[PDB]
Every structure is written in structure tokens, then in C-alpha cells.
């Protein structure tokens, strides 16, 4: 409500909350059937077609007080299967245990495990594709008294094998 | 089995293997006769591989699924698409299975819900599902089912 349309709609704040297994972020990899991935450049191009194939890669640039450390778990759950709600659950699917203290930028390439040869860009049905999910593997550890709530940024893009077809559009007044 | 068009066509054979492509044209609109408003919504569509827990309450753990694939579809863009390859437990899907243990094959289950929270103006949405079997191969050819299903 308040953070949409303002510049805070990009700052993902790792809070000073407990080890609640409820993910710290779950993104539905269903391009048009999920409002978030439709405002990205990659999403904009996908509003000019009907089909899309290939992989999409996710990057996570951590912006936390150098000294600060911790381990997060970026996980992906293939199409159809319900979004992982508990750590352990997600921990069993495709996941990278990204180390805050070691490398700042985390990349996770989501593959092309699709039924047909071309998936939709319409909300006819909610054909739940992937699920980019980030969980608290450990927790954040901060030196001395440095702000206990720092932020992260997420970047999405296409891969060289990404393609589109059937030029359609929607422009209004 | 629910739709006729695709059914008869698939019945012309006894066995098949087919990489299955699904498309999700999602459309919405407001219910109540009111000048109520809403922000663009994001729907989560979940494909659940055959032989898993089927979600009930929109709530429950089975909606997080560390394994089940999902697709977050933001409204107002090109419809969503995922390809689930031959997910048969046998060497072919049995269109007409003879014998005993109807659960024909089980191609999975789809669950769709709104991700956004409770908006004052209630919004309905219909999720159309399309299925293009690709790389299809078939076996023994039966006579076509003539009648009504």
C-alpha cells in the first residue's frame, strides 16, 4: 500500500524478527499472472508477445555493513509444486545457500523445465511456474552496534536462449 | 477427461507419451456494482507433480512447498506458460487401461489463488488453462468412441 509507487518498492529489508520459517521473500515466476515481474524491463518486453521460452536469472546484491555476515537460502521450486513455506522444505528443492559474509552478489539461474515448447503471458489460468524463495538459513550477525536492518536488491534478466513470438499488444486511452 | 474436443482426439490411440505445455490466460473484473478500486494483482499458479499433497485451505504449509513448482503471474501481461514433460510412472500414458487396481494416469493438480491481501472491493478472476501436447507419440489405434461421453 504505502511502499508501492514510492522508491522503497525496491529495498528488501531484512528485519530484526525471529526464526519464523515463513520465507523472507517468495516471488512467483509466473510473468503476467504475478504483478511483480511485469514491471521489469524483461516483463515489459513480455507484454508485447504471447509466448516465452528459455531461462531467467536472478541476482541478489546484498547491501549490508561490510563487517556484517550471515547465510540466506535462495530456493527455487519447479512448476506446479506449491511454494515452499518451511525452510527444510525449500532446502530440499533447487537452492543455493548464499553467504552474506563471503560474496555480496548472488546469482541463481532458473532453468526451463516446461511442459510445452512455449509458455503463456496471460492470466487465463494460474499455471504456477517457478518459485524464487529466500529464507533465513542462519540469521544476520552484526559487528558492534551497526544498524540491525539493512537492505537487499533483486535483479532479473533474460538469458541468451530466451525468445518470444506472436506480436500482440495493448495500448489504451 | 473433462473436455470433449481434446478427449476424442486422444482416444484414437491406446498409448501415448507427450511433453505437456500449459498456458494461463488470466482475466479479472470487479463483482459488486461499485466504483471500488484495486491495484494490479499477482496470482500464484502451482503445478504439483503427480502423487503429492493436494492443497485445501488457501492457508496451509502445502502452499509454500520447498519442492512444488509455482508461477507468480502479475496481471495485465502476456499469459503464463510452463512445460511439464512426460510425467508418467509407466512407459506411456494409458488412455484405456484394462484390468484392475477411474484414475487414468494422474497428470498432477493445479492450484490458483490471489497473493495480495483482502481488498475492500472484491475481485473475481477466471483462470483459463490451455494444453498443447508437444513431441507426442502414440501406439495401438482403437476405433473412435462414437457416442457421448
Amino acid at each position, epitope marked *: 500500500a504505502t511502499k508501492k509507487n514510492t522508491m522503497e518498492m525496491y529495498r528488501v529489508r531484512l528485519s530484526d524478527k525471529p526464526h519464523t520459517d515463513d520465507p523472507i521473500l517468495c516471488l512467483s515466476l509466473s510473468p503476467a499472472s504475478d504483478p511483480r515481474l511485469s514491471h521489469t524491463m524483461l516483463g515489459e518486453i513480455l507484454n508485447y508477445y504471447t509466448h516465452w521460452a528459455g531461462s531467467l536469472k536472478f541476482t541478489f546484491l546484498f547491501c549490508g555493513s561490510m563487517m556484517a555476515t550471515g547465510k540466506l537460502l535462495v530456493s527455487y521450486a519447479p512448476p506446479g509444486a506449491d511454494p515452499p513455506k518451511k525452510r527444510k522444505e525449500a532446502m530440499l528443492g533447487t537452492h543455493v545457500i548464499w553467504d552474506i559474509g563471503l560474496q555480496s552478489s548472488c546469482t541463481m539461474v532458473v532453468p526451463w523445465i516446461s511442459n510445452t515448447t512455449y509458455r503463456q503471458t496471460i492470466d487465463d489460468s494460474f499455471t504456477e511456474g517457478g518459485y524464487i524463495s529466500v529464507f533465513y538459513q542462519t540469521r544476520i550477525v552484526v559487528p558492534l552496534s551497526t544498524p540491525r536492518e539493512m537492505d537487499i536488491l533483486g535483479f532479473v534478466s533474460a538469458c541468451n536462449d530466451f525468445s518470444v513470438r506472436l506480436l500482440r499488444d495493448t495500448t489504451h486511452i | 477427461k473433462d473436455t470433449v474436443q481434446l478427449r476424442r482426439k486422444l482416444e484414437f490411440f491406446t498409448y501415448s507419451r507427450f511433453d505437456m505445455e500449459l498456458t494461463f490466460v488470466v482475466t479479472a473484473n470487479f463483482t459488486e456494482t461499485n466504483n471500488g478500486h484495486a491495484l494490479n*494483482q499477482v496470482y500464484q499458479i502451482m503445478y504439483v507433480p503427480p502423487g503429492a499433497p493436494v492443497p485445501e*485451505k*488457501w*492457508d496451509d*504449509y502445502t502452499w509454500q512447498t520447498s519442492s512444488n513448482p509455482s508461477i507468480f503471474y502479475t496481471y495485465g501481461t502476456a499469459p503464463a506458460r510452463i512445460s511439464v514433460p512426460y510425467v508418467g510412472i509407466s512407459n506411456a500414458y494409458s488412455h484405456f487401461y484394462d484390468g484392475f487396481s477411474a484414475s487414468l494416469n494422474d497428470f498432477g493438480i493445479l492450484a490458483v489463488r490471489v497473493v495480495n491481501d483482502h481488498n*475492500p472491493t472484491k475481485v473475481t478472476s477466471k483462470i483459463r488453462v490451455y494444453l498443447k501436447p508437444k513431441h507426442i507419440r502414440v501406439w495401438c489405434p482403437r476405433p473412435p468412441r462414437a457416442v457421448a461421453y
Partner: nanobody
Amino acid sequence: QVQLQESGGGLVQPGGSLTLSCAASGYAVSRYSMGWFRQAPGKENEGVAAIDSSGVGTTYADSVKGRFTISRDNAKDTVYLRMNSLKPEDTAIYYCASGFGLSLSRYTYAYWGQGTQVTVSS
């Protein structure tokens, strides 16, 4: 476009048991989990209650728990939060959102409500 209309928000007085309700447009309730977040006056947003009507998996906030009851309809596609025993801190502006989810977390949500304030002041 998915619509969630936040209704049932009005002034209660320390110990109130009011109820909120939100409809589901564009999608079937079970496709999205459903939740609530409150913007405490001059504070950041806090998760309150969230469940997915698919199989109904209840989850509440630490403060909120026990008192408030999150329930879901699949016929009218509505979420009913029975805000029982409302207290002075619970004087915040609520918002109904659909997640994935299946619970309380700033992000992990898609469509958001317009706005409604339940003032818990005698």
C-alpha cells in the same frame, strides 16, 4: 486485475471484537494465500494474520495470536478476520493482501488493499 475490497473497518473501544472482509476478483482464493498487514501510526508495516483457503493453514502474529481469527470462504471467496479483544496498540490501518505464502512477511505478497482504519479507542 485482482480486486480485494477491504470492508468492515470502524472505531472500536479497548476489548472490541470487530470483523474485516475482503472479496477475490480475477482469481480463485485457493490460488493465493490471504493475509493482513497493519501500518502502526508512524511505524513500519507488521504482519498480523495469514492462511491459504486451499487446505486452511492458520498462522498469526506474536501479539495478535489467540484473540484474532482468520477464516476463509471459497464460495464468496472472502477472508473474515475476527478481531476479538482489540487493544490500544491495535489502533492501526489494516490492509488485505494475497500471498503465496503462506504467512506474515513484508514481501511475498502480490495484490494489495486500498485502506481501512480500525481505531481501538474508548
